[PDB]
Amino acid sequence: DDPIGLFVMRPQDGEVTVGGSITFSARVAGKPPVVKWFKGKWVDLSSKVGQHLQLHDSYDRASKVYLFELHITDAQPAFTGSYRCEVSTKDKFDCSNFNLTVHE
Amino acid sequence: AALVIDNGSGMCKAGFAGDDAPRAVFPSIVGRPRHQGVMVGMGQKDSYVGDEAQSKRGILTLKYPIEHGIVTNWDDMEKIWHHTFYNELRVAPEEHPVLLTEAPLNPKANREKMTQIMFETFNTPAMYVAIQAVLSLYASGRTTGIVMDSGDGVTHTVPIYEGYALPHAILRLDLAGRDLTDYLMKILTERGYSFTTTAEREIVRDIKEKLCYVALDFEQEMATAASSSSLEKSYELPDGQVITIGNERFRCPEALFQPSFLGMESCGIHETTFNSIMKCDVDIRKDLYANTVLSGGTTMYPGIADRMQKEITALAPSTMKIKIIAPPERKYSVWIGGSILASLSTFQQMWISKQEYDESGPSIVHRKCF
Amino acid sequence: AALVIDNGSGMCKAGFAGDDAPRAVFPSIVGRPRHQGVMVGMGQKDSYVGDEAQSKRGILTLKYPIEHGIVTNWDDMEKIWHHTFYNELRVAPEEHPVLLTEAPLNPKANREKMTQIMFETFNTPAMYVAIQAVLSLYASGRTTGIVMDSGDGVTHTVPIYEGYALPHAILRLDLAGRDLTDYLMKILTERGYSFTTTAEREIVRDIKEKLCYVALDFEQEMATAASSSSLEKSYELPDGQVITIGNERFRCPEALFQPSFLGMESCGIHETTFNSIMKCDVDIRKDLYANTVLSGGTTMYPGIADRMQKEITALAPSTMKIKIIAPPERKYSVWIGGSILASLSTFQQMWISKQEYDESGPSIVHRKCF
Amino acid sequence: AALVIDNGSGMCKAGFAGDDAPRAVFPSIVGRPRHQGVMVGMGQKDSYVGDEAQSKRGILTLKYPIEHGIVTNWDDMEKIWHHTFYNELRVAPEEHPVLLTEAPLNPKANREKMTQIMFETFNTPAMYVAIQAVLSLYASGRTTGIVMDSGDGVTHTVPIYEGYALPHAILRLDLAGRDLTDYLMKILTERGYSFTTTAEREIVRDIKEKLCYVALDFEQEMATAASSSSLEKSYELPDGQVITIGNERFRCPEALFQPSFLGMESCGIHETTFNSIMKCDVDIRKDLYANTVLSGGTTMYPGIADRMQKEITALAPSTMKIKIIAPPERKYSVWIGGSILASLSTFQQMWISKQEYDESGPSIVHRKCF
């Protein structure tokens, strides 16, 4: 298939009930990698951080791997759509796609 | 058409463009239940917004959505806007474009997110972000002058000559009425009265609004305050206690004039205005001095213009007469400028549109406007 | 009637034949908005011409259409001409022939294009290009002599005998009132006052026109300038700021006499007048010295004639007595020569017709007139 | 041969003539206690001068003795000089003549007072006032050329041919490194970071010295600034707070090239250098372009010479190749000229004696030297 990027694990599609919590995560194998999260093709999730959306970054020393997490709580209709995860490397850029759905 | 919202500290003023008075005036405070409880017969009412909060002020812990022209929490602001559009305006956001007024040299993030929420949260065909000094100039009805913009949040200076702005000449000042309120509460403690609560914080501000007046000369009144008789007045509080204030009330507004009491090296409002004029071109300086306009929440007190007039006349050359115009209802002047600004046909073409936002992105705000 | 317009650096003179004082005098400047303006209610007016520019001078970036007697941009000139015929004059180009005045040894393109714009952009049956030295001679009322022409643009000398011309004998001098203004601004900087703006450039020129006067001797007053009591005067700017000058004001006119201050190899006005006379034959020299005529913008200051008379008498042969005539209002004398020149019936036959331009071309200007 | 002092903005460099590195480098700033102290056991040190001020920077209010090449307070300067002769140089002013470096077309009061303080405040048998452009000319080892002298304080251009000078051709530029720092602080505010204090003013300058660099082309990097990644860097303040900048850092140096951001009509450094050359004779123009010399505090950033080379090559005639020499340690090059100038035998005769000042007076400076 396509060339290998910096995502060891690509984000996975998820389903969430009303008032629930949903977490999406991506692993990067190794300056530390920079991660951007998007709604649609050009909408930045980072500018949307607040009560309903949080970003968490962590590092695992043993495997030289960075864990990036997206935290969604008290999800509402407005958040339904397509989300794109972009992670950059020291010399490369990579892209992945996933969907968030919240009904009722 | 335009819906006009003045986002100033403490009060949220909303209305319709072209109108001479805003439809909705309420505090911009959001109150939450500080104390936990278990009672049967309450809907709990976790979030309180508007004047309702003022009534239920003691239990509720007030939080200001906007600090120093910067919004700490975006969804609180949405509640404020939701409250303004439906509770008193009784109109739909869909019906008209919305005009928002923002202070000079404000951070990039505030304009981009504010437009982003307006395009996404409330669907409007177009929106525009305007600067408060320009709007005040239109309320004034004059094509040239120097504008003193001092709202509850931050004091700004923006000189103008026959239109055609001078960005370098625009200076931002860290002095404000809200700051005076903090100075005032700090000054009360030495006397023997202490207020450390947000709810009672407003009360000293209230005292300042009607019991405070501008001294023609600070040093002379302060000197005669030793033997005060007519300088002291009695104020009534919800607290159940009576407060008598003297030289303390007029020295609070003074800090705008004398930043030293606050603890800042920056010069006072009269010196800063002079500095703004010095920055400007020599040819346009002459009508700048006689065209000075005062606006905002803390410019309400009588005698401000009288003290400014002599101080500006003293520091400035005597070759030209110094006239300062400070008409009543100047508090709502910023809002008024917004309503007049949106009214003209040329302006409507200029509004940032939803189609443009989605196609190009948030970065277009700087590109389209100042 | 006829229309006479003076064009060529700093000012545009517009008027009617039959009048010794023109209807419209304004600077030849075009103002554009240097700073973009973000406001509502302005017509924007992206183009200012004339005295309006003078009022809105600080914001506008002034540009001179004419540099060193040469026009950099042709459409700016068209706006100026349009402005003179339509606004102040209130006349139609169709109604009368139009007279234009031009200095000697000026480049071909200025005569050809200027006629071309008059023939094409402003349709007229005929037009003529006249030279300042010949018109001054007619004003004088003498058919033989040598004319020293120094005014706006470039100083020129053109001797004539009984109507016959001597092209070799004609001398061009790179001195002008405008040049003095540049000298003056340059001299002000050493004293600690700096003007680098076109708008304030005029202000020093204004100073020079009434404050500056001609000393009997440059060296003695400059020497006595060490302790200046009455040599210093206070001038009031539109700004309201105060400027005091001393030996500085009288040394400005001096530069025409002493170009070394300007930084140019070429000799002063008295040496150049002498050089022009030397080129001419000895037989005609005798009435050349007694018939010297001074006219132009920079010849305004009193005592110029007295200094020139003594310097010319000293340097020149003592064979003949030296007489110089310099009457008041010499600044507009060149324009006056034009208005009178158009008045004569004989002159009307002589104008360069539109039909002739189209049939033969721009190159016939030299052919028709010397 | 004696002592050389560089009095540029921000830093005061002092040392001994004939040395390739000065003995004392410290800021010119004087710090005073902003707040009244409430402590017992302090000498209450009212005035702090030098690097001591840098250590105690937060409480102290820093005032610059020199503004735009002009000293606002004369006694502060005396403390600076007293500090330089005794604290680091450890020599007596009486022992050797003192050489001070002054920029061209500097105001008259600065030369007369500077000499007056040196003759009266400190005892010295002789002193001389030198011009930076000529000193750099000797340092470079060339008799003919054009010198671009830009110090931390002020930028000047002075062309020279075989020992002869052209005052008209000498132009003073209002651009300086200190100005860039002010532009920079002004630019930071829109991003959400605000600095209005003198103490933290230096911190942005520190950022500029290593973080800032010069782009081959301003417009292309700014265009790619939208998607910044490598453009933004993190700077550490004394406080521990973190500042991140992007296109903001390289645009600041640009204003030298493009003054329009500052808000001034006058053209940038490449246009001004060109203007100086145009004034000069065509014959001497050919080696002026290839002999351009850059010196001073603000010429430090890499790529300045490369950007200047194409811009000068583009605007200037192609009749001769354009060569620019920009050696390392250019900041201290001006100082070097002062030390070398003192060294020549001819120069010592030229020093203005203490005896001559007392008899003839302060006005002899123009008489005695250029």
Swiss-Prot record, chain A:
Positions that bind Zn(2+): Q54, H56, E69, H71
Tell me which residues make up the Ig-like C2-type domain: 3-102
Give the record's PTM text: Substrate for phosphorylation by PKA and PKC. Reversible phosphorylation appears to modulate contraction.
Q: Function of this protein? A: Thick filament-associated protein located in the crossbridge region of vertebrate striated muscle a bands. In vitro it binds MHC, F-actin and native thin filaments, and modifies the activity of actin-activated myosin ATPase. It may modulate muscle contraction or may play a more structural role.
In the record, what disease is this protein associated with?
Answer: Cardiomyopathy, familial hypertrophic, 4: A hereditary heart disorder characterized by ventricular hypertrophy, which is usually asymmetric and often involves the interventricular septum. The symptoms include dyspnea, syncope, collapse, palpitations, and chest pain. They can be readily provoked by exercise. The disorder has inter- and intrafamilial variability ranging from benign to malignant forms with high risk of cardiac failure and sudden cardiac death. Cardiomyopathy, dilated, 1MM: A disorder characterized by ventricular dilation and impaired systolic function, resulting in congestive heart failure and arrhythmia. Patients are at risk of premature death.
Q: Tell me the protein family, please.
A: Belongs to the immunoglobulin superfamily. MyBP family.
Q: What is this protein called?
A: Myosin-binding protein C, cardiac-type
Q: Which organism is it from?
A: Homo sapiens
From-to range in the entire protein, with total length: 151 to 258 of 1274
Curated annotation (Swiss-Prot), chains B, C, D:
Also noted in the record is:
In vertebrates 3 main groups of actin isoforms, alpha, beta and gamma have been identified. The alpha actins are found in muscle tissues and are a major constituent of the contractile apparatus. The beta and gamma actins coexist in most cell types as components of the cytoskeleton and as mediators of internal cell motility.
**Methionine (R)-sulfoxide: residues carrying this PTM:** M39, M42
* Source species of the chain: Homo sapiens
Its name, as the record gives it, is Actin, cytoplasmic 2
Give the family from UniProt: Belongs to the actin family.
- PTM annotation, UniProt: Oxidation of Met-39 and Met-42 by MICALs (MICAL1, MICAL2 or MICAL3) to form methionine sulfoxide promotes actin filament depolymerization. MICAL1 and MICAL2 produce the (R)-S-oxide form. The (R)-S-oxide form is reverted by MSRB1 and MSRB2, which promote actin repolymerization. Monomethylation at Lys-79 (K84me1) regulates actin-myosin interaction and actomyosin-dependent processes. Demethylation by ALKBH4 is required for maintaining actomyosin dynamics supporting normal cleavage furrow ingression during cytokinesis and cell migration.
Subcellular localization: Cytoplasm, Cytoskeleton
PROSITE patterns attached to this UniProt entry: ACTINS_1 (PS00406), ACTINS_2 (PS00432), ACTINS_ACT_LIKE (PS01132)
Q: What is its EC number?
A: 3.6.4.-
Q: Give all N6-methyllysine modified positions.
A: K79
- Chain residue numbers at which the record places covalent cross-link (Microbial infection) Isoglutamyl lysine isopeptide (Lys-Glu) (interchain with E-270): K45
Please spell out the taxonomic lineage of the organism that makes this protein: Eukaryota, Metazoa, Chordata, Craniata, Vertebrata
**Keywords for this protein:** Acetylation, ATP-binding, Cytoplasm, Cytoskeleton, Deafness, Disease variant, Hydrolase, Intellectual disability, Isopeptide bond, Methylation, Non-syndromic deafness, Nucleotide-binding, Oxidation
Self-association or partners: how does it assemble?
Polymerization of globular actin (G-actin) leads to a structural filament (F-actin) in the form of a two-stranded helix. Each actin can bind to 4 others. Interacts with TWF1, CAPZB, cofilin and profilin.
Instruction: List residues modified as Tele-methylhistidine.
Output: H68
(Microbial infection) Isoglutamyl lysine isopeptide (Glu-Lys) (interchain with K-50), cross-linked positions:
E265
Q: Which Pfam families does this entry report, sorted A to Z?
A: Actin
Briefly state the protein's biological role: Actins are highly conserved proteins that are involved in various types of cell motility and are ubiquitously expressed in all eukaryotic cells. May play a role in the repair of noise-induced stereocilia gaps thereby maintains hearing sensitivity following loud noise damage.
Enzyme class at the top of the EC tree: hydrolase
Picking any one GO molecular function of the record gives:
structural constituent of cytoskeleton
**Entries under Gene3D superfamilies matching the protein:** 3.30.420.40, Actin, Chain A, domain 4 (3.90.640.10)
What is the disease in the record? Answer: Deafness, autosomal dominant, 20: A form of non-syndromic sensorineural hearing loss. Sensorineural deafness results from damage to the neural receptors of the inner ear, the nerve pathways to the brain, or the area of the brain that receives sound information.
Q: Name one GO biological process term.
A: regulation of stress fiber assembly
| Any one of the GO CC terms | plasma membrane
Reactions catalysed, as given in the entry: ATP + H2O = ADP + phosphate + H(+)
